[PDB]
Design an enzyme around this catalytic site. Structure first.
Site: not given
Ligand SMILES: *[C@@](C)(CO)[C@](*)(O)[C@H](CC(C)C)NC(=O)[C@H](Cc1ccccc1)NC(=O)[C@H](CC(C)C)NC(=O)[C@H](CCc1ccccc1)NC(=O)CN1CCOCC1
Ligand SMILES: *[C@@](C)(CO)[C@](*)(O)[C@H](CC(C)C)NC(=O)[C@H](Cc1ccccc1)NC(=O)[C@H](CC(C)C)NC(=O)[C@H](CCc1ccccc1)NC(=O)CN1CCOCC1
Ligand SMILES: *[C@@](C)(CO)[C@](*)(O)[C@H](CC(C)C)NC(=O)[C@H](Cc1ccccc1)NC(=O)[C@H](CC(C)C)NC(=O)[C@H](CCc1ccccc1)NC(=O)CN1CCOCC1
Ligand SMILES: [Cl-]
Ligand SMILES: [Mg+2]
Ligand SMILES: [Mg+2]
Ligand SMILES: [Mg+2]
Lengths: 204, 222, 125, 233, 212, 222, 196, 195, 195
Positions: E1, E49
């Site tokens: 982000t 997210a």
């Molecule tokens: C920028 C874009 C990146 O830092 C921003 O900070 C954004 C904030 C927005 C989305 C509000 N952050 C993210 O995009 C964030 C980065 C991140 C990921 C994981 C942990 C911390 C920060 N992304 C997510 O949260 C993604 C969003 C999904 C893909 C729409 N979610 C995941 O990665 C999930 C949840 C992870 C998780 C966190 C805590 C506990 C358990 C799990 N994980 C997956 O979907 C796993 N994976 C995805 C790929 O396919 C196989 C499974």
């Protein structure tokens, strides 16, 4: 600290009716930081084209190495190296560093000047050859490229049509990968003419 | 991979699938896992793809030089010995799992080699990720005194078991028959039971769909 | 724990324990509140059957809940301390979470809520 | 967090036109030691279901007790306990599947792989799998452990899809199961020659076969095998 | 982000990207990273997210309950402190949240609070939060003045996100703009970087590093 | 040490039209290199014209679907048989998932149906509950293969109008149910070719105002 | 593996099972673990298949070269060559080898070589994973100067039990007889030995 | 070692390099020059692991000076950069690699053009209009994307450079004690004393 | 959070506290006040783990303010410090301890004497003429050993404090963006706006 995905990048190659195409993105970065948007990954030695993805220092090193080797080849053989022969030379060179390998994903493309047959090939980092009729993919968005190519591709495409297919395959794959994009280049290769086109793509 | 070897009346037959993986991704849908060491000594390979290719070519090269030196047709045990000693020296780090077979002045032979340098003898053998699926078929249908046509059928059936049941194997079936007194016949794509169905739609784009910034003629000539 | 329902309804629809608590207030020393245009004044009675008192140390009838709010009362003196203590704690808790001192309406509403809770809780009067 | 001590190997099964067949050997291994030889790993529930269990034997015996207790509990205040309100295979499975997933969710699993085979009240064949993780799936053929790798390929040659079930007789089906058990004896280092087999048919009911042995083995070719390459004697 | 918000003469500007990633996999280009808590309060989302989306939605329910109980809209300070006290209870449990609570009230005026998942709470005029925060800071700081017009402030916020969207590999998609005044928040559109980059390059004459 | 999670493979895909919505998913179930079932459905009708799939670890997937189906049942009891809107279902699912934030359901969840204006709707969830409405989403093992193809063919990304110098984009329009199924079938045949965990069969659930229809198609079994 | 070698009146007999494993999978059910390093000097191989094969090959090479120069080597000499390889490469080897041979002067002899590379000359020797289960049986049942038929029965009954209890052992029971008469190979199938 | 920047303009290349040398909780020196002159029209700045930086820089300097004497000729900036890249490309697969990142700013007298090369410790070379190593880039790149034009003068470049240093001084955690600025053009190399 | 200092002189206690708040490679704020008023004649500065610091400081502030209302009386600096120490002494053996270090500067109205207490996160209390937490002490203690006298005025104390800040700005690696200075005496607490 995974060498193959520090700098980022992609390459794709396709065949058509009496022609071949090879394309690549332009990004060079250091993990999240985008550094350069002019870093081309496709080189050529005579009529044989080589694309290389992976660790950028090795991409540069190998280009310089194959230029070196193909120049000596031409002097001694008194002819240009062919794609089939060059493919073997790449495989040899990579496997020579079996237990300390160049972190790369090279791709050969070209038309054999004697037979006129279109030719493409890919390799892993230790030199295993992957030949194909249809297409070869490489880089950090290889999964994406496999998906695009497998659905979009059809055989015996005309040079003008083949350009659209390979370009759409690269663009839409790059837009789903964080470490790929920032511009793109496409080479269309006919028997005795070669056109190079820079694509307009989203710059994020 | 799935690879097998089966002995019969007047020789030996080997077979293999044609899938090449890269993690969960199918890299090559039709790769050749049957290798020629000498004209009548062939090799089926599983494991690290570059290693099986490299080690088979190196020993194949040295076997050719040996054949010329001794003015004799090469023997399977020579290929076997050279392969195992090479692999043992590298303490398993060269990940080649081979089924070596062929005919020579001694007779017909069938062996297997593992990455660490151990060799095994048998009438029927199988290596690779789909070896258990293949071996199940072999153990169920193998008998003594097989004919040529029966051995091909058994071998290809064992490969099919791997193709269908093992996710590491798929696509087509390659076969190589090595009979005594005859030339070895290499049957590339002996079976093709995985043909891709017609696509529902053509994705040929209208010309001009892709946006372009620059054009330029590239100079390939001197 | 002591569970008995002490405050309960009667046939005529009255909660006697609550009404008898009002009698305890009626017994207590008088207290008065008058608000002007720019101020409020709290007046309080002190019974004069107690001479030889020490007025320096004797608990005062008017209590500060915060620097901007005060509380006076009529009825059982021992009971009043418990309400004042709870109010003073809630006053500091409000400043801590909302970053702003209580309104007089809010502080009243809290104290009134405490008083109500003791009219339909088991084991308490 | 567990580690399995005394263990049981493959359980194999398949469907046929009128019912289902299931089998499992009578071994209780203690690592490489083949410790216990009289272990029955098929447990019938009523006259219409058989539960086959692999993995830890202490946990198997616990599950035995639960099923035994389930029959008792169902009979309570139930005039139709041996009729309309009898325990179905689907009821028995779902109960186990619930337990297995609850135990994995408490990080204290029942270290097993289970196959519930039986016939429903309406005649339909029932065959479904469940394991320590709570994972469930159904298929015309099902097998655990080495059985998954070696038996399924052989059993799928008989019944490859749904439409092959009516075409498969009980004679053909049992033959395939017995063959698979022989292959597992050749190739599984923690298997035994002695095994049990159970058939649940919609017409003939529950047939439980004990003390079977693997037979008609091929070992004669071994005498011709000499050395590991270049030995001639 | 990449997210930012800054205070100025004409109120508050808030700008965010719309990308969501799972490692190097670009999962979404159309994520709404600004929560409209009420007509006078906004919240930005960076980090995990689910954590951000769940708790800032929960946050809006608590603030609704405040105005029901107190017959008055919640202050920006109190709003931000509910969030910071919540995440402090979960400190060490592994929540990942980088948020900014932006809004206007009578007593406070335009106010911005930075709140993150390790319990930090800071009032301030300028903040940039996310993996591309540094890229946004570079452009924003070098062009920031208090006396910016509403038109110029909106553009600077938009341009700062674009700058980060370009350089940061984990930022992009599109820019979402907001303007907060005494009368409440006003939405100023979704701007796709696909078209916006070239429009800005041509008109502004910037981005000379890129092949035109 | 005991590991409470596993990977059962497979892949799923949701597309939304003007007055309809589809939710597809392959019928293969796997662990490591073995096939568990060639037909194990993981797309479910949950009532109120809501279809759902939770791909990944099948035990967690089944548990979640089971709980949501139950959530729908109790919604009817507590609120006078009111129809659960797709937007309400999504928010409810977020709370199911986030409820286990510190011991997550390892699944990618997708639901599909019609919104309250009658228009097609697809929502997608991460493992811990973050959600988003979209026209288009692929999830699971082959999501990385299918998703960019959908960007190109459903949302017409990177496609410009011929002859307009890459200035005018290809206009967005809704796709017919016939055209959408074509894209689904081509997406899954492509994914089957290149991903080992994808194959055996394809099951599509279509959702219109009339109800929930099903369609099934064979896929390659290698 | 289960392997053993037993001296007797007329010479010495080697015995072994036929099982080769990768974890719990049986990679070969008809393995020949009795291998020739010289005409009448053989060995039983246990441990790593690759290591024991590599070693046996080198020993055969050394003894062939010995014979060309100095004539037939003693059984002790063969054991010494095995030792030299096993001891000097103890850090990189997993091999438990039993050396057995027939001289005319020295008659039957058995030398066992465990992991360390130490040498132990014995009347009989047992080794391999399945040997643990038959220490009790073999100690109670072994006698010196047995006949050929008695020794074959001793090895057959012993390995039968080792196979029965050890999961890492099984298949056929191979045997090799070393006497003045020559070299004789014997095989015994499950249907016979299991019901002993 | 921390901050090194570089900007190529119309007629010159400008390098800026921080003056601080820190070890532990002490700033040992605040007037350090993190650069070496390779040839009259080529300058190299460096940053990275302690010791490695100077040892590497001087080793390159010695080699280029040896070439100059041997051929009585100055190597082009492109040629020098390629030599430096190869030395680092060797280094990375050594027993103990040089952990040094460099910027090479030079003026090519044959082409009459300024040139700026950025090379990291892996041997990753790129020619750029503006460059930076370390955490500096995370601020300066986006800033220069906005404010940089290709036809700028040296004076315009110095103002553009002041804009970078100000931003770094505002947002960087560590005190880097300002920068030493040097200009490379057709007339050679000179230092700006008042920055 | 990083630099907090304290100096007790003849008639007052002077606290200095850095203004920077950093997280990662970004200075998020350069005007932060790392102190809370516990009572009219008692001030506490703090430094340590993010979040923990403010949460702890305000929790103490609430408790002391509650006491003041209840008794209509101000606790002595000695009494307040002992309360703070006990809270930290409890904390250290908790599931998740407060990682906060504090300085308590106060003026005792009954004794007519200034008092300075230094307490670390373990609950280690000491009364001192001058104190510091973190890496600051490694420079300031030896400096104050030399220049400090017990009979100094408030103005002499501020000059002595300037001498510390200058040294820290010269030799500390990180830019802490100056300090906020506050004085505690018989007339209460006041802030020096120009430092
Ligand atoms: C920028 C874009 C990146 O830092 C921003 O900070 C954004 C904030 C927005 C989305 C509000 N952050 C993210 O995009 C964030 C980065 C991140 C990921 C994981 C942990 C911390 C920060 N992304 C997510 O949260 C993604 C969003 C999904 C893909 C729409 N979610 C995941 O990665 C999930 C949840 C992870 C998780 C966190 C805590 C506990 C358990 C799990 N994980 C997956 O979907 C796993 N994976 C995805 C790929 O396919 C196989 C499974
Ligand atoms: C069945 C199909 C699987 O066992 C067969 O056994 C076949 C044998 C055929 C090909 C002869 N095996 C494979 O296809 C084999 C599986 C495998 C993978 C990884 C390690 C061992 C075995 N696949 C390969 O050998 C591929 C060949 C590609 C498709 C050209 N190579 C890789 O997967 C390489 C592995 C390279 C390697 C390095 C060090 C030790 C061992 C192997 N992996 C990659 O290229 C992945 N990655 C790409 C980006 O750059 C970093 C490496
Ligand atoms: C009995 C069985 C045990 O003492 C016998 O001693 C026999 C002796 C005969 C065969 C000469 N021993 C074995 O069968 C031997 C057991 C063993 C296993 C591992 C280390 C030492 C001894 N088996 C083998 O040597 C097999 C033979 C292959 C299948 C033809 N090799 C392996 O199991 C390899 C060996 C790698 C190795 C490890 C340590 C030292 C030397 C070599 N192991 C694997 O491939 C590991 N395997 C990978 C796949 O996942 C399962 C584990
Ligand atoms: Cl062996
Ligand atoms: Mg991209
Ligand atoms: Mg980006
Ligand atoms: Mg056994």
């Amino acid at each position: 600290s995974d060498p193959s995905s520090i700098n980022g990048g992609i390459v794709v190659a396709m065949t058509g009716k009496d022609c071949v195409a090879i394309a690549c993105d332009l990004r060079l970065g250091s993990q999240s930081l985008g550094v350069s948007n002019k870093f081309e990954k496709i080189f050529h030695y005579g009529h044989v084209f080589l694309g290389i993805t992976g660790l950028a220092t090795d991409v540069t090193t190998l280009n310089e190495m194959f230029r070196y080797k193909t120049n000596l080849y031409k002097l001694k053989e008194e002819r240009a190296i062919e794609p089939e022969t060059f493919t073997q030379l790449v495989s040899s060179s990579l496997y020579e560093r079996r237990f300390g390998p160049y972190f790369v994903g090279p791709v050969v493309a070209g038309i054999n000047s004697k037979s006129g047959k279109p030719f493409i090939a890919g390799f892993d980092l230790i030199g295993c050859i992957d030949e194909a009729k249809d297409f070869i993919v490489s880089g950090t968005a290889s999964d994406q490229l496999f998906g695009m190519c497998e659905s979009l591709y059809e055989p015996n495409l005309e040079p003008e049509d083949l350009f659209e297919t390979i370009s759409q395959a690269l663009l839409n794959a790059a837009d789903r990968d964080a470490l790929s994009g920032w511009g793109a280049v496409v080479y269309i290769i006919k028997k005795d003419e070669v056109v190079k086109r820079y694509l307009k793509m989203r710059q994020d | 991979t799935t690879i097998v070897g089966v002995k019969f009346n007047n020789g030996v037959v080997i077979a293999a699938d044609t899938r090449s993986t890269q993690g969960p991704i199918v890299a090559d849908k039709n790769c050749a896992k049957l290798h020629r060491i000498s004209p009548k000594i062939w090799c089926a390979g599983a494991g690290t793809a570059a290693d099986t290719e490299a080690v088979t070519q190196l020993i194949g090269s040295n076997i050719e030089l040996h054949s010329l030196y001794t003015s004799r047709e090469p023997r399977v045990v020579s290929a076997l010995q050279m392969l195992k000693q090479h692999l043992f020296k590298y303490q398993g780090h060269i990940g080649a799992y081979l089924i070596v077979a062929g005919v020579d002045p001694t007779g017909s032979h069938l062996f297997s080699i593992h990455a660490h340098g151990s060799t095994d003898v048998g009438y029927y053998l199988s290596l690779g990720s789909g070896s258990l699926a293949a071996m199940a078929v072999l153990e169920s249908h193998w008998k003594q005194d097989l004919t040529k046509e029966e051995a091909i059928k058994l071998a290809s059936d064992a490969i099919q078991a791997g193709i269908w049941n093992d996710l590491g194997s798929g696509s087509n079936v390659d076969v190589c028959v090595m009979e005594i007194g005859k030339d070895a016949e290499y049957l590339r794509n002996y079976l093709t039971p995985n043909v891709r169905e017609e696509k529902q739609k053509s994705y040929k784009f209208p010309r001009g769909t892709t946006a372009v910034l620059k054009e330029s003629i590239v100079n390939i000539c001197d | 724990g002591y569970d008995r329902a002490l405050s309960i309804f009667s046939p005529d629809g009255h909660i006697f324990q609550v009404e008898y608590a009002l009698e305890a207030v009626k017994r207590g020393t008088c207290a008065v509140g008058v608000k002007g245009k720019n101020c409020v004044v709290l007046g309080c009675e002190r019974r004069s059957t107690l001479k030889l008192q020490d007025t320096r140390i004797t608990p005062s009838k008017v209590s500060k809940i915060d620097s901007h709010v005060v509380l006076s009362f009529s009825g059982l003196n021992a009971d009043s301390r418990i309400l004042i203590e709870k109010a003073r704690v809630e006053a500091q808790s409000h400043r801590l979470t909302l970053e702003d001192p209580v309104t007089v309406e809010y502080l009243t509403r809290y104290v009134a809520g405490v008083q109500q809770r003791y009219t339909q809780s088991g084991g308490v009067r | 967090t567990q580690q399995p001590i005394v263990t049981g190997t493959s359980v194999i099964s398949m469907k046929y036109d009128n019912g289902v067949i299931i089998a499992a050997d009578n071994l209780g291994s203690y690592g490489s030691l083949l410790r216990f030889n009289g272990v029955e790993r098929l447990i019938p529930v009523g006259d219409n279901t058989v539960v086959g269990i692999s993995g830890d034997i202490s946990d198997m015996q616990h599950i035995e007790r639960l099923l035994k207790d389930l029959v008792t509990e169902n009979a309570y205040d139930n005039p139709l306990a041996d009729a309309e309100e009898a325990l179905e295979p689907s009821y028995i499975f779902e109960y186990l599947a619930t337990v297995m997933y609850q135990r994995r969710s408490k990080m204290n699993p029942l270290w097993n792989a289970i196959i519930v085979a039986g016939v429903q009240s309406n005649g339909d064949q029932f065959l479904r799998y469940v394991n320590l993780l709570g994972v469930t799936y159904s298929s015309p053929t099902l097998a655990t452990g080495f059985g998954a790798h070696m038996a399924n390929p052989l059993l799928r040659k008989v019944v490859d899809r749904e439409s092959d079930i009516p075409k498969t007789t009980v004679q053909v089906a049992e033959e395939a199961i017995v063959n698979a058990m022989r292959v597992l004896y050749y190739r599984d280092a923690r298997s035994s020659r002695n095994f049990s087999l159970a058939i649940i048919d919609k017409n003939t009911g529950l047939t439980f076969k004990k003390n079977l042995q693997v037979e008609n083995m091929k070992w004669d070719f071994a005498k011709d095998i000499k050395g590991y390459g270049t030995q001639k004697i | 982000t990449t997210t930012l918000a800054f205070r100025f003469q004409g109120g508050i500007i808030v700008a965010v990207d719309s990308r969501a990633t799972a490692g190097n996999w670009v999962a979404s280009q159309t994520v709404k990273k600004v929560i409209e808590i009420n007509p006078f309060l906004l919240g930005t989302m960076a980090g995990g997210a689910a954590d951000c989306q769940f708790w800032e939605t929960w946050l809006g329910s608590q603030f609704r309950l405040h105005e029901l109980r107190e017959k008055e809209r919640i202050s920006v300070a109190a709003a931000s402190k509910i969030l910071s006290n919540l995440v402090y209870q979960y400190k060490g449990a592994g929540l990942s949240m980088g948020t900014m609570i932006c809004g206007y009230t009578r007593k406070e005026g335009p106010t911005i609070y930075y709140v993150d998942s390790d319990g930090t709470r800071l009032k301030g005029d300028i903040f940039c939060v996310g993996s591309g925060q540094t890229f946004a800071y570079g452009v924003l700081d070098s062009n920031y003045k208090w006396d910016l017009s509403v038109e110029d402030a909106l553009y600077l916020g938009k341009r700062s996100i674009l700058a980060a969207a370009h350089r940061d590999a984990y930022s992009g998609g599109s820019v979402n703009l907001y303007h907060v005044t005494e009368d409440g928040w006003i939405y100023h559109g979704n701007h796709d970087v696909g078209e916006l980059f070239w429009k800005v390059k041509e008109e502004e004459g910037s981005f000379n590093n890129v092949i035109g | 040490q005991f590991n409470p999670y596993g990977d059962n493979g497979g892949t799923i895909l949701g597309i939304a039209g003007e007055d309809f919505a589809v939710l597809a998913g392959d019928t293969r179930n796997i662990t490591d290199y073995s096939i568990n079932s060639r037909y194990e459905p993981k797309v479910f009708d949950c009532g109120d014209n809501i279809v759902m799939s939770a791909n990944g670890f099948a035990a967690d997937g089944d548990a979640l679907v089971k709980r949501f189906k139950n959530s729908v049942k109790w919604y009817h009891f507590d609120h006078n048989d009111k129809k659960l809107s797709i937007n309400s279902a999504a928010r409810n699912i977020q709370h199911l998932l986030y409820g286990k934030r510190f011991f997550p359901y390892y699944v990618h969840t997708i639901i599909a149906g019609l919104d309250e204006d009658g228009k097609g709707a697809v929502y997608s969830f991460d493992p811990v509950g973050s959600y988003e409405r979209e026209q288009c989403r692929a999830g699971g093992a082959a999501a990385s293969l299918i998703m960019p193809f959908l960007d190109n063919q459903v949302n017409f990304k990177n496609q410009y109008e011929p002859g307009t110098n890459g200035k005018v984009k290809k206009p967005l329009k809704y796709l017919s149910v016939e055209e959408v199924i074509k894209l689904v079938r081509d997406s899954f045949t492509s994914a089957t070719e290149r991903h080992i965990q994808v194959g055996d069969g394809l099951e599509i659930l279509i959702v219109t105002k009339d109800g929930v229809r099903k369609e099934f198609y064979e896929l390659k079994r290698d | 593996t289960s392997i053993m070698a037993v001296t007797f009146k007329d010479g010495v007999i080697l015995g072994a099972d036929s099982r080769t494993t990768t974890g719990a999978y049986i990679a070969n059910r008809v393995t020949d673990k009795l291998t020739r390093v010289h005409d009448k000097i053989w060995c039983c191989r246990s441990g790593s298949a690759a290591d024991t094969q590599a070693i046996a090959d080198i020993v055969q090479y050394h003894l062939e070269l010995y014979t060309s120069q100095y004539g037939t080597p003693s059984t002790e000499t063969a054991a010494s060559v095995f030792k030299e390889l096993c001891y000097e490469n103890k850090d990189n080897l997993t091999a438990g080898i039993i050396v057995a041979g027939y001289d005319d002067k020295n008659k039957g002899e058995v030398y066992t070589i465990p992991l360390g590379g130490s040498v132990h000359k014995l009347p009989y020797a047992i080794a391999g994973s399945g040997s643990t289960f038959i220490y009790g049986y073999c100690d109670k049942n072994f006698r010196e100067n047995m006949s050929k038929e008695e020794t074959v029965d001793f090895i057959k009954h012993s390995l039968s039990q080792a196979i029965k209890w050890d999961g890492s052992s099984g298949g056929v029971i191979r045997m090799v007889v070393l006497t003045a008469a020559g070299v004789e190979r014997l095989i015994f199938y499950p249907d016979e030995y299991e019901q002993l | 070692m921390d901050i090194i920047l570089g900007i190529r303009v119309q007629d010159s290349v400008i390098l800026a390099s921080s003056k601080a040398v820190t070890r532990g909780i002490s700033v040992l020196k605040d007037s350090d020059d993190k650069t070496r002159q390779l040839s009259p029209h080529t300058l190299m700045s460096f940053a990275g692991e302690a010791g490695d930086t100077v040892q590497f820089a001087e080793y390159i300097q010695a080699n280029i000076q040896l070439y100059s004497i041997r051929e009585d000729y100055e190597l082009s900036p492109q040629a020098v950069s390629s030599f430096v890249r190869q030395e680092l490309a060797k280094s990375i697969r050594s027993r103990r690699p040089y952990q040094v990142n460099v910027l090479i700013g030079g003026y090519d007298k044959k082409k009459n053009k300024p040139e700026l090369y950025q090379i990291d410790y892996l041997g990753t070379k790129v020619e750029l209009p503006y460059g930076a190593h370390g955490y500096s880039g995370f601020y300066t790149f986006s800033l220069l994307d906005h404010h940089y034009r290709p036809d700028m003068t040296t004076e315009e470049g110095l103002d553009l450079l002041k804009l970078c240093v100000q931003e770094l001084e505002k947002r960087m955690p560590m005190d880097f004690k300002g920068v030493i600025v040097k200009i490379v053009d057709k007339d050679g190399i000179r230092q700006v004393d008042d920055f």
